[PDB]
Symmetry: C4
Subunit: 394 residues, 4 copies
């Protein structure tokens, strides 16, 4: 067992092929499957796993009542092999958590799980299944993190956390760890900007993150940092907005530096992702500009470096008649691919129940996962597929 | 870990002994078992596994409604150890798929799963659990493959795919891969012939396939190819027809070269198998000439090389009062047998529900598996055994 | 991985301590647990496992109806780790079987499973999970075997089979195998005797078996054989009868050579066991002389070599107010104990449902397991504990 | 595989961070989860596991009736990975047991399980899953042990047992074992004292235990011993009482030598724990002085060596509106932490059902687990979270 370098360039890809679909909610109509949300994927040297935040309750059970709620003492980070339902008997316990990130350094799994009261939460860092360190809330206002994979390079693992208001200026920090111990941290200066739920991946030895602005931006913040935690922060340059809510493309003008918002888009957002491709960018977004429905990915020419509106490729993986949700980035290491570059992949959360489906008492999600390939790949619509309401709703 | 040679001759066998029976539908009356169809078996160096296409739903659940349907975004290729039910908690996710093939090269599992729209489907190739390559539909008409084990020899794995009409001339291709990457392909010229759902096995360093003609043939196509993808294509010579539907043996005249059909047998078929035995052949077939009921295997003297009607052995493993379905071939590698030849085995799918059992809202199947041995073995009737209708049907 | 020698002497023990209890039927009131019977235990170098014959159906399901029946195409030999319930999700498939034996040679598991029609059954031998050989019925009358662990010594594994009438002279054979291939067999001459369901264990390089006479004997046959399959056959000498049904001890006179029966005890029996202890013997029996209720084990002074009635120790592990059933012998190898002798252990089957509990539609069993120790150990009553009837019975 | 030294000093810690929460009862509302009580945690070189005593029955099943009862033939010690629910399909069988202790010596798991009649019980010692030795009741009055992790150092494992009256002078013994064999024992002279359910941990090569006095003490006995089983015995000096029931702190005067009781606190207690910190002590207790509700941990200055009332730190992990129960100590070995000291951790049992919740027919518990860290950590209330009554209660 050796540490993964993970210092290779990110692969350039021309399409995204479906890798898995867990069908968790369909299965949970009868099987014993956790109510969850905030799923994500992370890969070790030999296996990829799906992580998720349970509600400490099962689908179609009375304890699934009121699971639209975000935080409780019953939520836990757990994982299953990629493609498995988040079920009661395969789930591996990772951390107590209502917010989390996880990744593998080549030797062991790192899991960071936040629990506790809103005004005094703390992250517990688990390494190889053992609690190694803690990070306390420094602003005492819902300490929270990525809800996707962290990044490990050369034995050091990195992640981003936020503490402070949901709809105004908050505080943003980058963390560095080795074998589960925090070894460095840096506060990111981003006045007028808002960073949450970063989707991060390694690219040529740096960590590149595409995040959620829940304040004044319908464009996505970009945060790039190195091993010293030196950073650049700004917004995805592209003249195509990729948060939700947002306005139609023709009503939007991009910015590399400033949050662009207004027009009824302020004070909300959704976790999402993008992948730099030289000067261009693959960016995901819901099909709807107002709701978490549909999902498509766009290749925007020069979209990483300028306010480009040129869409060279677009692929839809979920049509607008179906519910989506969070999306996030991860990479496949050289040990599984034998390539000289890191393969970019994304996952998609499909939320069922509240608030969009009010005749259900619960909220959960299922997922699809896609990986970049060297050729164009057709889209389709791989929807959650569950038939609501469920038994427990009647 | 080294690649399996798999270049040995196929064993000559005199009988087939039952190896496993999963009783999946009986168990799924109460247990949590996937609705499936198209099961198959493939063996690695140290383990054999049962693969299957789920419907992304469980038996006796409302989501099992309308599962007679062949393709959807919810179907997945999964696997369990040989003999296990295809259940919710042991199932290993392999690929998103409504058509599939899988095999083991000695080092890792290869799984090929087709999903997407009928007019723009694509296969995703998974190797060691990682997506490595894709194959796009080239005729834009239900790209489809074996629904049984592919063949690996000396580190290269091979499979057959079809694209085009179900009931007229289509296009047939052979694929070669190494570590999950397609390295060669060849289109098979077969004018007037139709190839689907090939059952393939290694024999003296070549791949021998017995397939389904869904057009004008009640005899089975035979496709034989080598590492260069050079091939011979034709029909099983035997003057005994082995597709379903077919006519009675006495109304049939064999052909090595031509599809023999008519008499109400055109435009359908069932996946099946055969094993060359020198110049002879073991071939499976349903007992009924018109429906998927019963199952028997026949040793036909010189049936691989001429229009022989001489049946030297016949063994029934399912009587005609019980539902059958697909059947397929696989082999056991030298690493498990210590023999100097590859052991021929077959599996049998037993379909319950629609269309034959109209009082059920669903369709699933269970399996039995048999392996060749050096002596004669008695038959019996190992039927699915489930008592229909089920709870969900009322 | 090397073959277990297993040529050590059997340990002398002064008591039996409980090792496990699976509580399978209690658990199966709600959990997903197979209907079974004929459980047994066998140990490999590093693990002991519980084997069992399922009915291919789960407790509290409609398919459990009529499971008092002994043979069907749906029965399978499966296994779980020692102490686990025989449940739907941990069970490992071993063989299709309505009669079976299994053991471990130090390198791999050997499983022998009999299925097929009563008049043409056959055993399939599985080695390392691969079908290696077959044994056909030679009398065409319910080929059957031990329903307990076989014995492996120096890489060869041995077991006993019977074919012929249940209530008159039948045919008895000993088998020798290496890596799953039958390498020798010997028919046992036993005129006027009847041998079924042998409980066998290694002792100083020979196999010692205590069996069931289902014909004229309420005393148990003893069969001892060596690697050449040379044998001695007779009855347990002790003047204490240990089959069921039997008469009270004071009405019984022992014999080393002859079946002793009559008085309403002919034509039935129950699988049981004994362990030679020098010239003495530990022998199990039901507490009731007429029914399968209660269980006790007796140390009979010189009971292996003469018609002794001297009981030096007696321990009850199940009181006569509770249902018992089959019992069987196995040993723990030196690799788990670091001893210079083989530890004798036994398991006890506790049958619930038909025929004793007529208000239930089903029959299943659970187990307790006990191992010999160097000191006296108190008894108790570890009964099945399920509360009948079950939901499905109403 | 080598034996763990475990001779390092115990770490000094300033706070306790939550490591896991199993949510077992919430999950068991629908999932298949054992009714349990007396959970505990023990760590091997590479994994921590949760152990528990089942009632041989599942939640929400009729067999859960009357599970307030402490002892039966159906109770078993089983384990799951840390954080998992004690469910029917992940549970590993360890021992038949209505009282137990378990630990890992670096090479194998040791499990000690007591079963049998109240007046003639015996412990079976399991090592590497094999029964190795027995300990008989020496006072014939409910032989019983820790219900938490034992301690292994340099290949020897130690635990404490009690036999005799629950509410008057009993007999207390320390045991030493190597590879599952008892190699030494010592009776502890403690006239007027009462020791049960010791929570023990290694500290600088000695075993330090904090126990339950069920007779005349609302203060906790302390037992410290070395490899020769030489011991010191007394009470936790602190002038803060930590048993339940107890009186308010201001009504209590500490003692290092004598049981301090009366005022309605005699003849009961609850399993609990403490950790020496130089001359100080971290000690757990229920928040309520009279009932098993709430849980807090206190750092008492010099509380190990004198009758101090100085509380320097206090952290609540369960508020007094929620049910608690047993608590216990364990340590994390150097192999998981790479530290030079042993990390102190504790678990908390949260009991639901009888006797406090009389509208339920059953009693079970779930757990939370916490580990010491080098900084202060906020508290919260991580309650069981199940909504009673359950289906089976109506
Ligand atoms: C992905 O594509 C980008 C853009 O084409 C590649 O970046 C170029 O790399 C070459 C070779 O070093 C340089 O000469 C160019 O200056 C780069 N262009 C830009 C815009 O950065 C990159 O090499 C590709 N990555 C991989 C892994 O193939
Ligand atoms: C299976 O049987 C076939 C037919 O008997 C065997 O093929 C023969 O092999 C011998 C030895 O090389 C040749 O002399 C013959 O010409 C072959 N006959 C035919 C019809 O091909 C084959 O060897 C057998 N296979 C195995 C593995 O034993
Ligand atoms: C079990 O007990 C028997 C009977 O006491 C032991 O058999 C004796 O072994 C000694 C030593 O070789 C011989 O001198 C005696 O002749 C034997 N007696 C009989 C009746 O066989 C045997 O050694 C013991 N087994 C073990 C493993 O300790
Ligand atoms: C935990 O704290 C205690 C108390 O401060 C430490 O014990 C001291 O150790 C030093 C160094 O050997 C001695 O000089 C003192 O006499 C000790 N004091 C007492 C009260 O025992 C102990 O070293 C600490 N343990 C660890 C692992 O850091
Ligand atoms: C820690 C916390 O509760 N995180 C929130 C998150 C949050 O409200 C926004 O980012 C605003 O700050 O939004 C949402 C969301 O669906 O919008 C889900 C999260 N749920 C959980 N991760 N549990
Ligand atoms: C891809 C596709 O849908 N394949 C079909 C197959 C097909 O219709 C025929 O071969 C004709 O082309 O027939 C049948 C069949 O039962 O006849 C099952 C298959 N179901 C699936 N593999 N899902
Ligand atoms: C193969 C067969 O059916 N074996 C029988 C066995 C048998 O009837 C007697 O030994 C008489 O021959 O008896 C019994 C028994 O409970 O008496 C259970 C067995 N059930 C099974 N092993 N399935
Ligand atoms: C062996 C036995 O039954 N141990 C008891 C224990 C005991 O009654 C007291 O310590 C008094 O002696 O108390 C309690 C308790 O909840 O107070 C649970 C235990 N339950 C079990 N471990 N099963
Ligand atoms: C969910 O909560 C609401 C409000 O308390 C209640 O009316 C409803 O019955 C609950 N559903 C269940 C299944 O408990
Ligand atoms: C299955 O579908 C049919 C037609 O939509 C419907 O009538 C029937 O009730 C469905 N069954 C279930 C269990 O939903
Ligand atoms: C079991 O079989 C009997 C006889 O056929 C029948 O009367 C009874 O209803 C059956 N029970 C179930 C649950 O099917
Ligand atoms: C539990 O036991 C009581 C007393 O015997 C009984 O009244 C009650 O119905 C039982 N509950 C169940 C589910 O059997
Ligand atoms: Ca926004
Ligand atoms: Ca046809
Ligand atoms: Ca008899
Ligand atoms: Ca007390």
């Amino acid at each position: 067992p050796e540490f993964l370098n993970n210092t290779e360039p990110l692969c350039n890809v021309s399409g995204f092929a479906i890798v898995s679909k867990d069908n968790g909610i369909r299965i949970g109509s009868r099987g014993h499957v956790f109510v969850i949300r905030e799923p994500f994927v992370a890969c070790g040297p030999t296996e990829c796993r799906t992580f998720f935040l349970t509600q400490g309750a099962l689908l179609n059970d009375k304890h699934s009542n009121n699971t639209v709620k975000d935080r409780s003492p019953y939520r836990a980070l757990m994982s299953v092999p990629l493609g498995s339902s988040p079920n009661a008997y395969q789930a591996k316990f990772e951390s107590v958590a209502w917010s989390a990130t996880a990744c593998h350094d080549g030797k062991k799994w790192l899991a960071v799980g936040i629990s506790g009261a809103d005004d005094d939460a703390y992250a517990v860092i688990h390494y190889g299944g053992m609690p190694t360190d803690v990070v306390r809330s420094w602003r005492k206002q819902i300490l929270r993190t990525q809800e996707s994979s962290c990044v490990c390079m050369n034995g050091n693992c990195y992640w981003v956390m936020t503490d402070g208001p949901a709809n105004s200026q908050a505080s943003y920090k980058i963390f560095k760890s080795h074998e589960g111990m925090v070894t460095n941290e840096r506060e990111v200066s981003f006045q007028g900007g808002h960073i949450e739920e970063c989707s991060c991946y390694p690219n040529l030895g740096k960590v590149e993150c595409v995040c959620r602005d829940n304040w004044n931006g319908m464009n996505r913040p970009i945060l790039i940092f190195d091993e010293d935690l030196d950073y650049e922060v700004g917004y995805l340059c592209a003249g195509i907005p990729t948060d939700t809510p947002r306005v139609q493309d023709s009503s939007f003008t991009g910015s590399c530096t400033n949050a662009v918002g207004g027009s009824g888009t302020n004070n909300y957002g959704v976790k999402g992702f993008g992948f730099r491709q030289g000067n261009s960018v693959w960016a995901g977004r819901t099909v709807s500009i107002s709701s978490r429905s549909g999902f498509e990915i766009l290749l925007i020419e020069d979209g990483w470096i300028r306010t480009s509106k040129t869409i060279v490729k677009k692929v839809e993986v979920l049509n607008n008649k179906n519910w989506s949700g969070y999306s996030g980035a991860f990479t496949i290491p050289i040990t599984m691919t034998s390539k000289q570059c890191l393969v970019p992949c994304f996952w998609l959360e499909m939320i069922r129940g509240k608030p969009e489906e009010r005749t259900s008492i619960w909220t959960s999600s299922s997922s699809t996962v896609f990986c970049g390939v060297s050729s164009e790949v057709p889209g389709w619509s791989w929807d959650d597929g569950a038939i609501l309401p469920f038994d427990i709703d009647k």
